[PDB]
Design a protein around this ligand. Sequence first.
Ligand SMILES: Nc1nc2c(ncn2[C@@H]2O[C@H](COP(=O)(O)OP(=O)(O)O)[C@@H](O)[C@H]2O)c(=O)[nH]1
Ligand SMILES: COc1ccc2c(c1)NC(=O)CN2c1nc(Cl)nc2ccc(F)cc12
Ligand SMILES: [Mg+2]
Lengths: 427, 68
Amino acid sequence: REIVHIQAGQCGNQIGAKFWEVISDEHGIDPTGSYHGDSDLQLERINVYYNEATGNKYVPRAILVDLEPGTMDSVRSGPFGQIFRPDNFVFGQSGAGNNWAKGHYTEGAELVDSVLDVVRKESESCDCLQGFQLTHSLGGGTGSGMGTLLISKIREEYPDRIMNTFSVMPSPKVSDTVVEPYNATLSVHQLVENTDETYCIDNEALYDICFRTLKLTTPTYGDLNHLVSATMSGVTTCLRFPGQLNADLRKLAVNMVPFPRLHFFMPGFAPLTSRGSQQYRALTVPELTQQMFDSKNMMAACDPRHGRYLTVAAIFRGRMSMKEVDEQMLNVQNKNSSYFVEWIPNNVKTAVCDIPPRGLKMSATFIGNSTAIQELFKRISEQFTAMFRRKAFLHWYTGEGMDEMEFTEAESNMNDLVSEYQQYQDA
Amino acid sequence: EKREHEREVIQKAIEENNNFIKMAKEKLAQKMESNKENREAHLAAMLERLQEKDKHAEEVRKNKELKE
Ligand SMILES: Nc1nc2c(ncn2[C@@H]2O[C@H](COP(=O)(O)OP(=O)(O)O)[C@@H](O)[C@H]2O)c(=O)[nH]1
Ligand SMILES: COc1ccc2c(c1)NC(=O)CN2c1nc(Cl)nc2ccc(F)cc12
Ligand SMILES: [Mg+2]
């Protein structure tokens, strides 16, 4: 069951690149593609993410896409840059100028077919293709506008494969330009329709976690992206490693998504760590469990106590008692049973994998489908209409073909989405 | 339907980039043409009266020949 990875634009390629570093280290694959690991657990499911090349080398099933040659050249120059199959670098030259319209309708249109061709070559190699996972941000133009255009086209060619994204939410605390709320509202409309699973990586939550909890006074994208690679390794654990679960994207979607549009997950991680500095006490299973449910460990700036958990998946990494995991997990439910819906019995599921991630002896990754994610979609809807009620900055988009109407629809679909999350917070 | 829309938006951005080069090109030619006529019309007015001055210097000299 192969997965096809796609990373698009400045942000999607920078986090895209860290993911492949991180998990290439966990599977003992080095920057040349040669395996040098200890456990067989590292290669039993290597094919989910890697293609096996002649000479028994491993090549990520990764398609790298940008409207600009900038970041993508930095990937090729990066530590694992040589691991990526070079034919899979697809890129224009004009850039997308942080403009959703250029990504989706003008500039991205030129380039999308060439991306769809590399996607096709990869899919055909595939034995049983589960689907796709995309890394992008919603606040610029390539990953946001072109990214969702790809997602639309992939779903037309492969209507019955799973579509998974890692979508970075914009935030005034980490913002390139003032049109990010416009770009993200337009994308969120796309995502509600055309993905099975999206992980809401909020840059607001990454920022606070960097500032308040890691005490980083002035956090770079590299600090934010350390958090993003930790969560990304986490949520993909039960797909890359052998365990009792041995999950795939579809079973994941079936059990997490009770209603098709409510497929926006809050990720969470524990222990929160800051790059380089390693602390030396491992956590106790009770600590992982309290921290991982802690709002301070959520990667989407939502208060879980303001919503109800529709469903929950939790993944524990390291040598530890599955008895104490069972006990610590049963205890946080029955302590805070108010915050889980009664009408999906037994909606918290847990898995364990022996291999911990690099640097830590024990770790807990949290995947929550909480109705409190509406707080995110409200935050962005507020910034959206704060400008749109004055039609501010709109010309950047009417200049590339778009109509005011298209904004009213996207705005409207998102307010609908927030109403839908609100319906089940009372049910 | 979505692709029908996707090509209508890029057709609009072209339509409008074009209508804008058009109306500029035309606004220019209109201005450059109304300007040659105006400036000429003015230089013509100046001469017509500088020459009506020459006709009056004929009439004046032809009067002193009605002296002799
Ligand atoms: N967490 C994180 N966010 C990023 C990074 N780079 C860009 N962003 C966010 O993405 C938005 C800009 O979109 P970007 O991907 O750079 O534009 P694009 O190249 O056209 O896709 C901004 O709001 C940033 O906050 C990164 O490395 N890490
Ligand atoms: C809430 O009920 C379920 C939630 C999630 C899942 C599931 C049932 N059953 C399945 O087969 C797929 N699966 C999971 N999928 C993936 Cl990719 N990672 C996981 C990590 C931890 C975990 F506890 C479950 C999963
Ligand atoms: Mg940028």
